[PDB]
Amino acid sequence: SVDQKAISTIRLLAVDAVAAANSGHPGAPLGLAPAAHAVFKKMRFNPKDTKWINRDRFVLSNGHACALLYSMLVLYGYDLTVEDLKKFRQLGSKTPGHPENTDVPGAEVTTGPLGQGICNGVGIALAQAQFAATYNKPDFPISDSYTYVFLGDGCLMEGVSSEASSLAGHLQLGNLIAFWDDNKISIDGSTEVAFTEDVIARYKSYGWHIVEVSDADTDITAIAAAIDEAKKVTNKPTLVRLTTTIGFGSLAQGTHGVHGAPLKADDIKQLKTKWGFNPEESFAVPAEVTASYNEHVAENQKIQQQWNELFAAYKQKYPELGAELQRRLDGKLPENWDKALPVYTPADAAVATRKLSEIVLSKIIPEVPEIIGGSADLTPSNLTKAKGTVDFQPAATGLGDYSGRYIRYGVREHAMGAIMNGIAAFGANYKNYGGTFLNFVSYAAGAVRLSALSEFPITWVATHDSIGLGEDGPTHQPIETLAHFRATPNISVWRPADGNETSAAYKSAIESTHTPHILALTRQNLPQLEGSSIEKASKGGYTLVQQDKADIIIVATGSEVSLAVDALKVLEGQGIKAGVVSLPDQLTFDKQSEEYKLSVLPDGVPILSVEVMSTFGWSKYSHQQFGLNRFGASGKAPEIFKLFEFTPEGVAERAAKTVAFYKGKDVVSPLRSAF
Amino acid sequence: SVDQKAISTIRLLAVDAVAAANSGHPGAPLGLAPAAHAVFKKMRFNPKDTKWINRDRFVLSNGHACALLYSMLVLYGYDLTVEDLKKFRQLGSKTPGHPENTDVPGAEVTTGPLGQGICNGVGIALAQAQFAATYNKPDFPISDSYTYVFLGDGCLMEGVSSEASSLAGHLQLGNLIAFWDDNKISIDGSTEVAFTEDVIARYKSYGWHIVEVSDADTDITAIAAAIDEAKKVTNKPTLVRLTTTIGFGSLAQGTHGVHGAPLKADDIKQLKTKWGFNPEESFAVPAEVTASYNEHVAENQKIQQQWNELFAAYKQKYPELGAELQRRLDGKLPENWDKALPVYTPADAAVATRKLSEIVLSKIIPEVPEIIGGSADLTPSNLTKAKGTVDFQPAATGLGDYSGRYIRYGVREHAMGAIMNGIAAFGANYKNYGGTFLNFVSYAAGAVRLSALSEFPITWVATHDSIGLGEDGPTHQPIETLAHFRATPNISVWRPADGNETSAAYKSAIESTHTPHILALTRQNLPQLEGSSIEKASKGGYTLVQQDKADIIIVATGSEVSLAVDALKVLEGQGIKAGVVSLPDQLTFDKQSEEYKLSVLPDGVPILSVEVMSTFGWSKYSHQQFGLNRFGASGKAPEIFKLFEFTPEGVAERAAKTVAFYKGKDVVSPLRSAF
Ligand SMILES: [Ca+2]
Ligand SMILES: [Ca+2]
């Protein structure tokens, strides 16, 4: 049949791509080709409009199997060709060794690191439910799409997938349909060596529906029927167990050796012969397969055309909601939304930046409907929903509704990070956030790094940023955390000092389209600074206190800016004139013009950094660094600051030493370099 | 009864400690006091010998409940007093807000970050099984101890606990007994908001045994019986469901408000009144409770005395095993074990450092019985057991034995990290390791940080360290990873360049007693260097190529040392004389004398760093830094190096620019500072 020919075509494209690279993973593509064929036949998508908001989404969580994804995209006429397949895993190609959403048309997310894609799928499905609840009306099914995820044994061992699966079951996400490649093989060999749990029993315990397909090597009718069954279960995510043979058809089928290395040339020849292909030919695409796939694309394009007309009729009946939806699909925030950002003066009271952040959210959430977010491993007293909103929950629970805006992630930081990526990936201008303690953003490093690589505008609301949290002690107090994330490409790491800086941090986070944000916020109260503003803080770094005859400039962030200002007064008494620079986001500052940056950190003056965390990175901006490069302590916060000499007198002493160290030396800006 | 009085005493000590601090968590201590009393009565331990190797171990994984742990330790006469309790959460006290194994007698591990303690318990139990299989003989039960773990709802949501629980069930760890505080409350409020899974069904799916105690607020008889039942099930870890009231006895019992904030003073008064205590008195310890607890301590001390005699008789019957066990309990490695480390010369072939590491392990494992380890999310071709050993598995599986030395962790990096901490915590000189790709050590950051804080000599064997891995691409290629871990206090991060440096890295890792190690190893082949040795590399940084008239020194690590040596030859052709420094471990180097360090990085010469990763940290050792501060690429590794100009010519160009930049400038060592 043409279906059988299509499956062979998929298999052989994947095998041939791996062969050309002499690198990559042919086993899972061979095993999953029947399922991929069956699922893509059920999916609604337009290869010529990858951003259609009512498309079904597909996520290949076992991302090493991506020769499979690329083969599907090529066969369906996405902006990816057989010539691109021939360049699989080759420098600069459109077919990298793991799929990248920035580089690959039809790759919704960046997968490869195990466990991530299934969580991303949870987030896409969460967003779809929230979006549909927000926009759908009687006779106007604006959003009714499904989220299809392929996953492997490795994904099921990673804790992040357990977290997301528990939460997805709780959230009754009936438009999520996941497929487990039950092939009994991982990298180390048999799953009998380390993975003997009853996976199906576990998924039932989370509240998922199960369908089992006992012969997924051939039974595409049963795979299609499993999809139909899953669609009837509207209040549970579904796991479809696909019992497959890894490397199906290969001489080495059913072995670990086919998981992650190219097949032997003679093996590829017999594959081709047994499936009716020419063993002397590579990258064959039978025209009958193309025709069959083009028929499904044509049908999907007519569905999209009808959706466009539905949307036009929606705008006529619901003008305000229609305009809102149009604006979001255009990628634009509401006009002048930022007028809602709170502004402070030095006459206002001291406030913790965690509380300032709460206040910002309270003001902007009602004005910007595409903001949703939540928290994990965090008291409601440290972050909760904006007044006038409700939690995102299935209505059946009585605890919220899918129209809700605040997600109760539970104690699941890593999955929260990966789910945020999926919400961003959904599109429709979603600007989503996740709260936890800064120190436990580290639990989610796998996902955070992927936010950066994937260019997703997600936001971490990361409170209790330092020893300033006090009594919980060194297990909770960040030291290395900002250095870690600042060292990662494409992460804005805001550490605002006061009310105006906190508003600038949110302006950046919400306006972002390609850069994830981490907002490092305090437990303890900080003063409103003389010289701060949203305008100046928006530059990432700025001159807070200008001193034309400066003996030294102190550059600081967050809680240490006020400390620097107090140190300036001590230094004046010692006959030393200091300027102060506030550097709320190093990435934003780095992106400013060279002349702007040099106006902030000029030549001819020693510069001392102060931040109660690792000194790593700080030499970009300073000659000497006062930081904390040891673990913290359990006690009242002001006593810990005194212990480590983060006091006005301690800063002044180090500033005076810095001035002395550079007497008679020529000093140029830390921004200067040799290359 | 005295048992009831003891439980009230525990409860009130915990409440009073939280009250004195005006900080901390009284709810779980109130709920878990009956269970803590019952479990400690069943445990064998000596408060006067916290390191008795056959003690039962207790782990409080819900570490925020530590007022409870401290109360138990005080009541049993550990080196912790009521005066220490009065200083709970106070700077410099022996009673920090979360328990720290370095600071607190009877704290086996450092808990607080959720999910970790249960995994640590898995590791303690794994080590006990391996230890018993190694040493026990007929009539000589050298090791027969249990591992008791308390955990909460938050712990059960964290993915790391799922990973460890799946693995513990697979490993049939029948001496592990965990207790779930089933109190329906987390920080956000009811578990109904985010945690509605069937926990018991999930634990059955992992192969655990279950006991349910429906009234754990009062039924200590049933808690004791649950322990007895668990001990009869020798081939499954057991989860005991303790249905408790959070804050039991408080006016606010059964609410989120009692989870993490001090009780009201009037509430504490009525607690005391209803339990027969004086509401005007704090930190009361009834003498009858002390007597009862002292009786159990006396009995346990007689058990230890009998164990000491058993050990003496074991040494008579089994002299060689006895001497080995004695050596390990003394914390000493075999005499001259390091003579087994491989040594190379520049005449030897190029080898990848991953392969050099395999070879080291192959040579040292047979000589050092306290080395065990494994791998997670890694092909057996990248790391497997040492020849002549077997996997650690229950014999019932036919796949290994508990005497085995190689652990199949599955795709569970985070749990592997936390389990390694538990193996180290067991003691007996265990020197344990875990293999994965360097980029996915980040999945385990929560545990890695705790290795550092806890001072555990664990080792990560972290291969595929850079863009040198090639085709898997930017999702797999570390950029930020070494900066992250180098910025963390107390982590040795070895990046060996060649065979001799790899042997030095292992010498450091295995000799370690207080510092975790990460070994960053290459996929690609590297040459044996002229000038390397185990002796010199043991200093962390050393002069590889000395040049008395140097125009520049190039400092490099790992794969970039050979690159620097090739660049020296290009520079000679341009009339520039360079020295080379190899810096295989920054921490070890930092610990050397100031004079040694200055001999390596002298004044009066520009210094350029080269490492194909983040430049963060490198200004400690250099004036200019050539690194990679963007994500990688998917292609053949040598082509990626060429793209980013990590070539002899690219290094030489930057070196020449550095020389030019410092012409006419006075240059001092990067090791100099103002303070
Ligand atoms: Ca598999
Ligand atoms: Ca609880």
- Report domain extents, chain A: 1-326, 327-538, 539-675
Subunit contact A192:B636, Cβ cutoff 8 A? no
Collapsed DSSP state (helix, strand, coil) of residue B176: strand
**Phi, psi (degrees; rounded to nearest 5) at B159:** -60, -35
Does A1-326 match A327-538 in CATH topology? yes
Provide the H-helix boundaries in B387-438. Answer: 413-426
Any idea which ligand is nearest the CA of B151?
Answer: 2
C-alpha dihedral (B543, B545, B550, B554), degrees to nearest 10:
-70
The rounded distance, in Å, linking the Cα atoms of A552 and B465 is 40
Comparing CB atoms, the residue among B157, B473, B616 nearest residue A616 is: B616
Q: How far is the CA of A70 from the centre of ligand 1 (A)?
A: 20
The rounded distance, in Å, linking the Cα atoms of A22 and B506 is 33
CB atoms within 10 A of CB A397: 15
Distance from CA of A617 to the nearest CA of B (A): 5
**Residue B531 φ/ψ region, left for φ over 0, alpha for ψ in the -120 to 50 degree band, beta for the rest:** left
Distance from CA of B613 to the nearest CA of A (A): 9
Subunit contact B112:A640, Cβ cutoff 8 A? no
From the centroid of its chain, how far is CA A184?
30
In terms of CA atoms, which chain B residue is nearest residue A479? B488
The b/e string for A587-625 (b: 16+ C-beta within 10 A; e otherwise) is bbbeebeeeebeebbbeebbbbbbbbbbbbbbbbbbbbb
Q: Decide if A605 contacts A450 (C-beta within 8 A).
A: no
User: Which among B158, B358, B413, B560 is annotated as catalytic?
Assistant: B413
Collapsed DSSP state (helix, strand, coil) of residue B177: strand
In terms of CA atoms, which chain A residue is nearest residue B662? A674
The rounded distance, in Å, linking the Cα atoms of A104 and A89 is 13
**Which residues of A are identified as catalytic?**
413
Q: Decide if A223 contacts A177 (C-beta within 8 A).
A: no
This PDB structure is determined at a resolution in Å of 1.3
Q: Residue A362 has which token pair?
A: 């309270």
Comparing CB atoms, the residue among A157, A614, A674 nearest residue B658 is: A674
In terms of CA atoms, which chain B residue is nearest residue A450? B475
CB atoms within 10 A of CB A309: 10
The rounded distance, in Å, linking the Cα atoms of A279 and A295 is 28
Q: How far is the CA of B177 from the centre of ligand 2 (A)?
A: 19
Residue B613: closest CA among A577, A256, A488, A438? A488
Provide the H-helix boundaries in A62-190. Answer: 66-75, 82-86, 116-135, 153-157, 159-170
**Phi, psi (degrees; rounded to nearest 5) at A51:** -105, 10
Collapsed DSSP state (helix, strand, coil) of residue B414: helix
Q: DSSP states of A330-392 as a string? A: TT-PPTTGGGGS----TTSPPEEHHHHHHHHHHHHTTT-TTEEEEESSS-TTTS---TT--BB
What are the angstrom distances between the C-alpha of A327 and each of A137, A368, A370? Answer: 18, 11, 10
Q: Residue B55 has which token pair?
A: 């003690």
Q: Which residue has the tokens 């399922």?
A: A35
The rounded distance, in Å, linking the Cα atoms of A643 and A633 is 9
Subunit contact A110:B475, Cβ cutoff 8 A? yes
Interface mutation vs chain A, best among B554, B634, B639, most A CBs within 10 Å: B634
Distance from CA of A466 to the nearest CA of B (A): 14
Beta-bridged to residue B147, according to DSSP, are B57, B176
User: Radius of gyration of chain A from Cα atoms?
Assistant: 28
Distance from CA of A472 to the nearest CA of B (A): 5
User: ∠ at Cα A328 (A327, A330), nearest 5°?
Assistant: 65
Q: How many residues does chain B have?
A: 675
Q: Decide if B478 contacts A619 (C-beta within 8 A).
A: no
Q: Residue A428 has which token pair?
A: 């429709």
Q: How far is the CA of A256 from the centre of ligand 1 (A)?
A: 9
Beta strands, E only, B224-362: 238-243, 351-352
Subunit contact B399:A197, Cβ cutoff 8 A? no
The rounded distance, in Å, linking the Cα atoms of A142 and A242 is 32
- Supply the angle between the helices A159-170 and A413-426 in degrees, to the nearest 10: 70
The rounded distance, in Å, linking the Cα atoms of B553 and B557 is 13
Q: Per the annotation, where are the binding residues of A for thiamine diphosphate?
A: 64, 112-114, 154, 183, 259, 413, 440
Beta-bridged to residue A147, according to DSSP, are A57, A176
Subunit contact B197:A186, Cβ cutoff 8 A? no
Q: How far is the CA of B12 from the centre of ligand 2 (A)?
A: 20
- Supply the angle between the helices B159-170 and B116-135 in degrees, to the nearest 10: 20
Q: List all residues 6 or more positions away from A433 whose beta carbon is below 8 Å from its beta carbon.
A: A371, A372, A373, A374, A420, A458, A459, A460, A461, A509
Residue A168: closest CA among B189, B197, B198? B197
Subunit contact B399:A206, Cβ cutoff 8 A? no
Residue A158: closest CA among B331, B545, B443, B338? B443
The rounded distance, in Å, linking the Cα atoms of B236 and A261 is 37
The rounded distance, in Å, linking the Cα atoms of A298 and A562 is 63
Subunit contact A480:B476, Cβ cutoff 8 A? no
CATH of A539-675, one of 1.10.1660.10, 3.30.300.30, 1.10.150.110, 3.40.50.920: 3.40.50.920
Q: Decide if A558 contacts A519 (C-beta within 8 A).
A: no
Exposed/middle/buried for residue B549 (C-beta within 10 Å: 0-12, 13-18, 19+) = exposed
Q: How far is the CA of A157 from the centre of ligand 1 (A)?
A: 11
User: ∠ at Cα A663 (A660, A668), nearest 5°?
Assistant: 110
Q: Residue A659 has which token pair?
A: 């001035």
C-alpha atoms less than 13 angstroms from C-alpha of B181 in its C-beta half-sphere: 31
Provide the H-helix boundaries in B411-553. Answer: 413-426, 445-454, 481-486, 499-511, 534-537
Q: List all residues 6 or more positions away from A308 whose beta carbon is below 8 Å from its beta carbon.
A: none
CB atoms within 10 A of CB A251: 14
The single-letter code of the amino acid at A374 is: G
Q: How far is the CA of B27 from the centre of ligand 2 (A)?
A: 9
CB atoms within 10 A of CB A501: 32
Please give the CATH number for the structural domain made up of B327-538.
Answer: 3.40.50.970
The single-letter code of the amino acid at A353 is: T
Q: Which residue has the tokens 């060429």?
A: B642
Distance from CA of B247 to the nearest CA of A (A): 17
C-alpha atoms less than 13 angstroms from C-alpha of B467 in its C-beta half-sphere: 28
**Phi, psi (degrees; rounded to nearest 5) at A437:** -75, 145
Q: List all residues 6 or more positions away from A610 whose beta carbon is below 8 Å from its beta carbon.
A: A554, A555, A556, A560, A563, A564, A567, A626, A627, A646, A651
The rounded distance, in Å, linking the Cα atoms of A471 and B23 is 7
In terms of CA atoms, which chain B residue is nearest residue A112? B475
What are the angstrom distances between the C-alpha of B164 and each of B209, B237, B383? Answer: 15, 11, 21
Q: List all residues 6 or more positions away from A156 whose beta carbon is below 8 Å from its beta carbon.
A: A180, A195, A199
Provide the H-helix boundaries in B547-671. Answer: 559-573, 586-590, 594-600, 637-643, 648-662
Q: List all residues 6 or more positions away from A309 whose beta carbon is below 8 Å from its beta carbon.
A: none
Terminal Cα distance for chain B, rounded: 62
Any idea which ligand is nearest the CA of A155?
Answer: 1
Any idea which ligand is nearest the CA of B243?
Answer: 2
Q: Enumerate long-range contacts of A339-346, CB under 8 Å, 24 or more apart.
A: A340/A364, A340/A367, A341/A503, A341/A506, A341/A507, A341/A534, A342/A499, A342/A503, A343/A499, A343/A500, A343/A503, A343/A534, A344/A498, A344/A499, A344/A500, A344/A528, A344/A532, A345/A528, A346/A527, A346/A528, A346/A529, A346/A530
Architecture of domain A1-326: 3-Layer(aba) Sandwich (3.40)
Q: Residue A79 has which token pair?
A: 């902006």
The rounded distance, in Å, linking the Cα atoms of B584 and B537 is 7
Q: List all residues 6 or more positions away from B443 whose beta carbon is below 8 Å from its beta carbon.
A: A113, A158, A445, A446, B413, B414
Residue B629: closest CA among B608, B616, B614, B644? B614
**Phi, psi (degrees; rounded to nearest 5) at B585:** -140, 115
Q: How far is the CA of B254 from the centre of ligand 1 (A)?
A: 44
Any idea which ligand is nearest the CA of B114?
Answer: 2
Any idea which ligand is nearest the CA of B247?
Answer: 2
Q: Residue A68 has which token pair?
A: 């499979």
Instruction: Enter the DSSP assignment of B441.
Output: G
In terms of CA atoms, which chain B residue is nearest residue A437? B113
Q: How far is the CA of B230 from the centre of ligand 2 (A)?
A: 23
The rounded distance, in Å, linking the Cα atoms of A368 and A332 is 11
Strands A492-494 and B517-520, sheet pairing: unpaired
HEC letters along A496-534 = CCCHHHHHHHHHHHHHCCCCCEEEECCCCEECCCCCCCH
Interface mutation vs chain B, best among A443, A621, A666, most B CBs within 10 Å: A443
In terms of CA atoms, which chain A residue is nearest residue B671? A624
Q: List all residues 6 or more positions away from B137 whose beta carbon is below 8 Å from its beta carbon.
A: B314, B317, B318, B321
Beta-bridged to residue B241, according to DSSP, are B180, B212
Size of interface A-B (CB pairs under 8 A): 362
Q: Per the annotation, where are the binding residues of A for substrate?
A: 25, 259, 354, 381, 464, 472, 523
Q: Which residue has the tokens 């050309």?
A: A20
Q: How far is the CA of B380 from the centre of ligand 1 (A)?
A: 15
Q: List all residues 6 or more positions away from A89 whose beta carbon is below 8 Å from its beta carbon.
A: A21, A23, A24, A95, A96, A97, B471, B473, B634, B635
The rounded distance, in Å, linking the Cα atoms of A486 and A590 is 11
**Residue B483 φ/ψ region, left for φ over 0, alpha for ψ in the -120 to 50 degree band, beta for the rest:** alpha
Q: Decide if B3 contacts B37 (C-beta within 8 A).
A: yes
Subunit contact A635:B89, Cβ cutoff 8 A? yes
Which residues of chain B neighbour A449 with C-beta distances below 8 Å? 442, 480
Q: List all residues 6 or more positions away from A553 whose beta carbon is below 8 Å from its beta carbon.
A: A547, A578, A579, A580, A581, A601, A602, A605, A606, A607, A608
Which residues of chain A neighbour B453 with C-beta distances below 8 Å? 474-475, 631
Collapsed DSSP state (helix, strand, coil) of residue A479: coil
Subunit contact A194:B410, Cβ cutoff 8 A? yes
The rounded distance, in Å, linking the Cα atoms of B105 and A483 is 33
Distance from CA of A113 to the nearest CA of B (A): 7
Q: List all residues 6 or more positions away from B497 whose beta carbon is below 8 Å from its beta carbon.
A: B353, B526, B529, B532, B556, B557, B558, B559, B561, B562, B582, B584
Q: Decide if B210 contacts B238 (C-beta within 8 A).
A: yes
From the centroid of its chain, how far is CA A24?
25
Exposed/middle/buried for residue A626 (C-beta within 10 Å: 0-12, 13-18, 19+) = buried
Residue B426: closest CA among B374, B383, B372, B363? B372
Q: How far is the CA of A91 from the centre of ligand 1 (A)?
A: 28
The rounded distance, in Å, linking the Cα atoms of A219 and B280 is 76
**Residue A16 φ/ψ region, left for φ over 0, alpha for ψ in the -120 to 50 degree band, beta for the rest:** alpha
Comparing CB atoms, the residue among B98, B470, B631 nearest residue A453 is: B631
Q: Residue A27 has which token pair?
A: 């086993």
The rounded distance, in Å, linking the Cα atoms of A89 and B474 is 11
CB atoms within 10 A of CB A122: 30
Distance from CA of B293 to the nearest CA of A (A): 29
Residue A2: closest CA among A295, A211, A394, A308? A295
The b/e string for B143-166 (b: 16+ C-beta within 10 A; e otherwise) is bebbbbbbbbbbbbbbbbbbbbbb
Which residues of chain B neighbour A475 with C-beta distances below 8 Å? 63, 98, 100, 110-113, 450, 453
Residue B173: closest CA among B394, B477, B489, B469? B394
CB atoms within 10 A of CB B287: 7
Provide the H-helix boundaries in B49-139. Answer: 66-75, 82-86, 116-135
The rounded distance, in Å, linking the Cα atoms of A672 and A602 is 10
The rounded distance, in Å, linking the Cα atoms of B292 and A635 is 34
Residue A252: closest CA among A242, A267, A266, A237? A267
In terms of CA atoms, which chain A residue is nearest residue B374? A188
The rounded distance, in Å, linking the Cα atoms of A79 and A77 is 6
What are the angstrom distances between the C-alpha of B601 and each of A622, B301, B492, B540? Answer: 21, 55, 20, 13
Beta strands, E only, B93-200: 147-151, 176-182, 185-186, 189-190
Which residues of chain B neighbour A91 with C-beta distances below 8 Å? 633-636, 639-640, 643
The rounded distance, in Å, linking the Cα atoms of B488 and B511 is 21
**Phi, psi (degrees; rounded to nearest 5) at A392:** -75, 110
The b/e string for A524-550 (b: 16+ C-beta within 10 A; e otherwise) is bebbbbebbbbebbbbbbbbbbeeeeb
Any idea which ligand is nearest the CA of B246?
Answer: 2
Collapsed DSSP state (helix, strand, coil) of residue B175: coil
Exposed/middle/buried for residue B553 (C-beta within 10 Å: 0-12, 13-18, 19+) = buried
Subunit contact A450:B201, Cβ cutoff 8 A? no
Comparing CB atoms, the residue among A471, A483, A674 nearest residue B616 is: A483
Residue B89: closest CA among B102, B108, B70? B70
Distance from CA of A478 to the nearest CA of B (A): 10
